[PDB]
Symmetry: C3
Subunit: 529 residues, 3 copies
């Protein structure tokens, strides 16, 4: 009953999902109980072919069928999924839903100031993505190119990512807060042929110099032929360099509201996302197309319990993986609306998140514990002003969630009527690795619980390098086989990838984190090592 | 029986298809009668998916299947057909027929002088297209490029077009009678990477300077990297620029007679065709939808069977040659007669001599040529055996009842069906036409709208559809159709403003028409160019006249431009006098007819409102003034 | 009849049935039941190519897109095409599919010049290395429609380079590692290659060969080559790499992952260029398509050699030549079996090396040229008894005639009279076997290639009348009456040369350049080239190219090169040279050596003349053109038979020619 190693697990009562979760659920859940989850999970570990093939055919639309579900090993860094298949990410995120229901909302955009907020339908999104992709195509962007994005969290960032993917090019999103030198490093490592940005940004009421930093960086980025500049503030004193910089509205007005998507192979790169590592300069994590999209759709459907009637609010930023997988690809693949918030949880007041959740009857909310701490400190009383009865799944990501913060989140935001998903994962995993499925897995505050489909998690003794048998254990967290959404390389530097992830413990994927596993199989993340 | 509006139709007896038509028809007709036509037409309007899906699979060969038959709306300018599909135009016009019957004639080429005439089979055409496509491929031409063609109406023009389409590039054919400036404008707007032309041309016995005008134009066309030059006259004095120009024969001899075609998407551009009042605009046509329209209209309106032979006396420099000298007939796998010369050379019987020589079953020509031959060569017609013909088409302009009767009697001997085909460059293929052997004729009427064409008459003042027959108004189309043009090259806003925004929810043909008690349409010609300001349609000419009535005004020019709020805005070029002129227009025309702004200028273009249009959107010397005052 | 009045080779020749031990060692039921089934299937392959080759193409190749038409075009119009509309990838069919099925199965059994450096790559290993090299090439801009040169010895890196280039839809052009810098230059420039794959140095017979050095020398004049990939075969640090152009195989492949998607190409997109010598002077890049070439390779390897999944093939060839292309690489790898890639010579460390390798790996199939058989019979017979060769059942011979005596020697000393011998007739332009005895099916006549293969409708044409010869006991020009899947499709950027060489000499036919005879049983007997092409030790040479090389020496005024029989190399090249101002018989030996070295450095060591004859002038017609017929007749000791020479402008010269050949051919 007691734990000698996993001290966090002693005297922790399981927390079943509240009845109101199932009352607010629009349809029968996707999994009935934990026993069915464990059957499906064991099948996903022992027979990835027969588990993931059918799901890949169910959740994604293919332009060419695949012939092999899974190939490669971790030790050889040659992982591949759905080999021979062809598809397009923008077709799966936009076109098919637009044909099905063009007036269904897609991007619920909340601007830094609410007066500028708007809503794009899937039909709208198809037209705007097509026009921007037509601009990029006229400029010579084609499959195999990279295109940089330097935009805030708003419709233009989503449209730019989808338009780049529509051509089979790989987008490289650069968080709008980066310095000119960070922009330069990333652009040059990726050899981007084009950049998409805006003139200025609005954050918490303040105006941010965006094009200015781009211009500073581009003096050292010779590969950038053309820049597309959105008029976010329309400030006339913002310089565009003749022959390089063009306005978003002016160029998109020249092209039609439909452009054919370009088919890419399952293993063609979908994007580069640059991350800081423990050794040296930024490294470009490369994600494939089919595997990443399947992981995004699968984790969004099963871990958050997303249905067609639902509305996801991922309070993240597309500059990071969270916005990639769960503000954009995850929800759009499933054809539900997603809320794109440009501002901050404090402007105009600390009720912004909640005013938004009420306004759009959001059903899912996904945020990092940092924001939870900020709102507990400075804006608790605001929560009661707004109706949050539409929610049933509350997500937490990025860092450990202390039991204190977990209980506060559960009571004040969830009104003790929602399910909480502590999702553990990382930029290189593509999608959730360990997380409690909504309406299925009972919670232990501070614990991410069970590994997800295709994630064969294990603990390794660092001193010896040997895998640790049995529960009530602690050690380095690692995965014993690759999974569909695993990152495939570091751009033009596969040796760094091998040394970072595959070579510390040959045969395993090294997460860089230490964790504990208790007598129930629940995992407790203990941070970086 | 009487018409109070459609005066053309009063006292007009229907003209049934003559029995000789069905005697000469090689097989059972494709449609039995008008009732079957109407059932099929109603399905093509109410259920485009169930009507055009099966036809697209029947008439075209696909590399990848389509998942959606029809997408988009006119209002949003995002029409698309057969989404997800892949195909190749040259495979559908050449390869499949060559594999089925390589010795069947494809291009029956009649040169300016008959001594130079020849016939290419489908196998011959496959080899020549493959070799030219190999030359272009070795030069770097690929999907997404544009390639200019400046060639007379002969085998090399057809081969060039098909070879460019074989690589998935888009051809832009430039009528060989165009000047150097016209070549330059079109090549630069399209940013063509290569050009295919010839040294000189032969027309009416005269030698025309083709390569010379090309050089003149190319001095200012930096995107053209290479030129392929056919030796039409083999004149040794014709200079080739080293490193840029290469000979057709020399380069094609280096490559094999088969080259794989490149699959393109249904909505990838097949061609740009530049149109000749203001600035030339590149009408862009898709691949799958355009080809389907070409095949469908050629088959059903002309009644084309595998045994038939089509003579379209047009020029690939224009949409008629594109669609009914090349794509339509070759798609159906029949021979097409490509005539390089004039109706008068060596004499005024040449058209009829060609029909007799090749036993053509179908003849398609513009009323302009019919009038010329009636005036100068009538007696020549009877000198030739024209009994192989059963379908006589007319295109491009109204055919008066009198010219229709002359055509019917002197060419058709009262034994052929006449198809007065109404359509335009932007429609891709026939919009309103009497189906051969099916629809009875009223001379001068185009008769019924074609498959997928939901035609209507619109009140020009209110934009509201006119219900019932015995009516007149603006001819408009209520939904897009497979072969509708998709954009204006790199200028989609001009496309929207020209076709979709004047009457939102409709396609604007620019023509007026009348509809009689039988549902037959009578084309009435161009309308008067209204500008749409927040739903009020204004006449630039009326505003100019009203401004001119003011005796202190010397000259007035009124133009329209795009406006994100009011759709269009009106700018007049001519502090207190400006207000006086605006009030003058308000009290002469109406309160809402006032220009958005009156700009007092001392100069205006003529040497031409086009300059004013471009100026308002941010004697050559005069130009400066226009700009200066607009800066005011 | 039983007697032959024309095909003398066939008189008194007893058929040689397949020995029973062949069937004892055969691992499964044969692919063909007996010779009658072979004849039924062959007739279908001629009368109904669509119904015969469609199903086989669907069985043996994996398609990304199905084909809609099996066969198109005619020889006369030079527009042959097969499996139109199809899409596939050669590296997927040679690697990926087998790696997915059995990643640990051996693929490349690599025997290095020194056995200590030997190793084995599995299909999984091969997939990873091919993917990495393809990743390097892709990052350099190589894409479908480009050509990439390979200048590598016969080892794993050559195979990997070829497959990596094909993985991107680019066409490889392999340049035999015995070529000089000028030959590399000619081929690289005619193809406009964007990149080159080579190595620092080579190992042959224990000697170190200069590979990268010759590449640098040639590349000074190859402006289209943007980047070079260099494998460290010896890792000699003194080997210079040019900054900005040359990069190391290991360094660059370490940057990319072990899987890269293959690029789908059309059946008729070019798979490779192989530069071949003819009666011209300039090498011609023979172009092979993808689907048809691969189908021919798989089909001939499977049916003529009787290859099964359990078998192991040792083709003692070099990828620098078509034999290595088709039967060391594409054929076996398509069929998913291991192939032995031998970097060395038959003589090093001793003359048992071939048999040591066969025994080491229990090879079931061995494929070699008669030149090597003659060498081993002369110098290494005593080695054979040291080795267990009982794993073998199919012994192939390629590239040149196999005399009845050599056939018997091969049959007895290597096969122990228990193996089937496959004398395979074919050529670079045919892609795969044209006439050959199917192992276990066709009985042999020693010296005869036997029956034409599937899709090969062979004929004999009267050299006087140009008319096809009906009936048997006949002789004439060997021609083929319709194209076949693996037929070469063009000469790179010179289709007119292709037409003039192969399709126009005998309209409606393919001209092989060979003469042949057909006996009363329908067996074909190859009689050798009719077009004066010379084959020295399996290498096709251009007498005109050798003449040009000799003339480059400014001491030479005129040069005429001819071919003759040679007991060692099959044919030998004899060069006749007239000098400007020479004389002095003491300088003769030295100047002859100088000219031989000139040829060695212009073309390559293997193109050196057997002998250089210094004469005072060459025989010429009234029009001033050299009459090589006289030099041929003299060089074969047939001075009698020269006949009336009063038609020459300089009949007096003939005497000298004869005397000179008598004095100098020996010494
Ligand atoms: N639920 C969690 N509980 C405890 N720790 C967590 C949790 N989620 C993330 N982490 C830490 O963040 C890194 C990933 O950061 P990254 O920005 O790459 O991806 C971010 C996640 C989008 C992990 O390696 C780990 O140390
Ligand atoms: N049967 C017809 N009866 C009366 N008028 C006609 C008819 N066909 C065309 N037109 C006029 O020509 C324009 C199109 O010209 P375009 O050169 O683009 O297309 C050329 C015709 C292929 C129409 O809008 C219209 O005004
Ligand atoms: N079994 C054989 N019996 C007699 N002669 C043969 C045989 N195989 C080839 N040849 C001669 O080689 C030329 C082609 O040589 P190539 O190097 O192109 O291809 C060689 C095959 C690799 C043939 O035209 C012919 O003259
Ligand atoms: Na494809
Ligand atoms: Na496909």
């Amino acid at each position: 009953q007691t734990h000698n190693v996993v001290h966090e697990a002693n005297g922790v009562k399981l927390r079943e999902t509240p009845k109101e979760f199932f009352e607010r659920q629009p349809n029968k859940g996707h999994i009935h109980d934990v026993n069915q989850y464990k059957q499906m999970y064991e099948q996903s570990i022992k027979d990835p072919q027969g588990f993931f093939g059918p799901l890949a055919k169910e959740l994604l639309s293919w332009d060419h069928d695949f012939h092999t579900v899974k190939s490669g090993t971790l030790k050889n860094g040659d992982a591949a999924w759905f080999l021979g298949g062809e598809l397009n990410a923008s077709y799966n995120c936009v076109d098919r839903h637009a044909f099905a229901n063009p007036d269904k909302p897609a991007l619920i955009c909340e601007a830094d100031d609410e007066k500028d907020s708007h809503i794009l339908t899937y039909g709208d999104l198809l037209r705007e993505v097509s026009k921007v992709a037509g601009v990029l195509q006229s400029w010579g962007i084609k499959k195999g190119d990279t295109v940089a994005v330097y935009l805030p969290m708003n419709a233009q960032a989503i449209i730019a990512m989808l338009a780049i993917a529509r051509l089979g090019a790989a987008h490289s999103v650069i968080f709008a807060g980066f310095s000119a030198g960070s922009i330069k490093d990333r652009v040059n490592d990726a050899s981007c042929k084009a950049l998409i940005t805006c003139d200025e940004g609005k954050r918490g009421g303040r105006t941010t110099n965006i094009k200015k930093l781009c211009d500073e960086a581009l003096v050292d980025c010779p590969t950038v032929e053309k820049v597309l500049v959105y008029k976010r503030t329309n400030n006339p004193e913002i310089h565009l360099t003749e022959g390089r910089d063009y306005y978003w509205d002016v160029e998109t007005a020249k092209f039609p509201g439909y452009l054919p998507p370009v088919s890419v192979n399952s293993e063609d790169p979908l994007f580069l996302l640059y991350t800081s590592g423990s050794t040296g300069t930024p490294k470009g994590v490369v994600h494939s197309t089919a595997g990443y999209l399947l992981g995004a759709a699968l984790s969004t459907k099963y871990i958050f319990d997303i249905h067609p009637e639902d509305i996801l609010f991922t309070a993240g930023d597309v500059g990071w993986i969270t916005g990639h997988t769960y503000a954009l690809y995850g929800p759009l693949l499933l054809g539900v609306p997603t809320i794109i918030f440009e501002g901050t949880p404090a402007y105009p007041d600390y009720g912004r998140f909640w005013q938004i959740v009420e306004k759009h009857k959001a059903t899912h909310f996904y945020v990092a514990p940092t924001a939870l701490r900020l709102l507990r400190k400075a804006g608790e009383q605001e929560i009661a002003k707004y109706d949050l009865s539409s929610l049933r799944t509350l997500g937490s990501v990025g860092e450990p969630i202390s039991p204190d913060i977990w209980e506060w989140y559960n009571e004040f935001v969830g009104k003790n009527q929602c399910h909480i998903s502590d999702t553990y994962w990382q930029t290189e995993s593509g999608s959730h690795l360990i997380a409690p499925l909504a309406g299925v897995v009972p919670n232990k505050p501070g614990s991410a619980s069970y590994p997800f489909f295709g994630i064969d998690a294990a603990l390794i003794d660092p001193v010896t390098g040997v895998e640790i048998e049995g529960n009530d254990a602690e050690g380095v967290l690692a995965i014993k086989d690759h999974w569909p959404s695993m990152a495939r390389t570091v751009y033009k530097n596969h040796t760094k990838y091998m040394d970072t992830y595959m070579n510390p413990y040959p045969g395993y994927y090294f997460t860089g984190d230490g964790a504990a596993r208790d007598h129930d199989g629940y995992y407790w993340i203990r941070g970086r090592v």
